Amino acid sequence: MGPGFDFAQAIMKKNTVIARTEKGEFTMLGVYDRVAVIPTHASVGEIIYINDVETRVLDACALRDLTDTNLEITIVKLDRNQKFRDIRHFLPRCEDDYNDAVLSVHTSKFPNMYIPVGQVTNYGFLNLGGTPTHRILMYNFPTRAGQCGGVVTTTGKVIGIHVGGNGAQGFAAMLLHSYFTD
Numbered sequence: 177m178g179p180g181f182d183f184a185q186a187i188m189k190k191n192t193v194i195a196r197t198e199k200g201e202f203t204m205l206g207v208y209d210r211v212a213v214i215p216t217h218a219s220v221g222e223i224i225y226i227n228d229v230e231t232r233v234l235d236a237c238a239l240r241d242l243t244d245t246n247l248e249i250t251i252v253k254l255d256r257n258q259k260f261r262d263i264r265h266f267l268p269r270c271e272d273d274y275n276d277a278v279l280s281v282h283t284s285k286f287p288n289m290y291i292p293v294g295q296v297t298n299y300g301f302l303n304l305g306g307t308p309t310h311r312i313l314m315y316n317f318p319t320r321a322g323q324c325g326g327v328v329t330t331t332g333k334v335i336g337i338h339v340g341g342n343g344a345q346g347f348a349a350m351l352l353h354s355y356f357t358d
């Protein structure tokens with residue numbers, strides 16, 4: 177409908193796949209080469225389904241900060257025959273607050289879904305499902321089961337992936353450029 181939705185659509189149309197694990201179907205953001213991200217609660221194994229194709233997992237790393245605190249981001253390298261468009265230059269370098277964000281989801285349950293969530297707070301610490309978690313972003317939208325892995329964008333920046341909610345607020349794990357240096 178406007179330039180926020182334009183940037184979100186550009187990311188969804190080229191840089192997402194549908195990931196299926198034993199714990200469900202997730203929006204999965206591809207970042208560069210065969211490297212993608214997914215919430216750590218997806219419990220990625222040795223094999224994952226990518227757009228309903230059986231795919232070997234070459235590497236999976238559940239990220240923690242240097243306090244050894246959960247970040248809820250797993251970086252996955254996929255044995256796929258095709259590379260993602262490199263979007264690392266759209267990742268923030270530092271922790272920050274944002275205005276006017278969009279949460280975008282693409283699954284069998286929620287195809288082509290875009291939500292204007294408004295202001296995003298650098299919330300920091302969250303007890304997420306009983307697990308102490310750092311680098312959480314918060315938005316005041318009643319997000320629901322099925323939106324985990326959804327991409328959080330502003331115009332020109334990919335800032336997080338949706339990892340939970342409490343019925344009134346939604347919570348995303350930050351994406352930082354430093355997670356994807358090589």
Ligand SMILES: CC1(C)OC(=O)c2cc(Br)c(O)cc2O1
Pocket residue numbers: 318319320321322323324339340341342343346347
């Ligand atoms: C009520 C409650 C906790 O129920 C869910 O199952 C749920 C899942 C996601 Br994902 C979310 O953003 C928010 C949610 O709200």
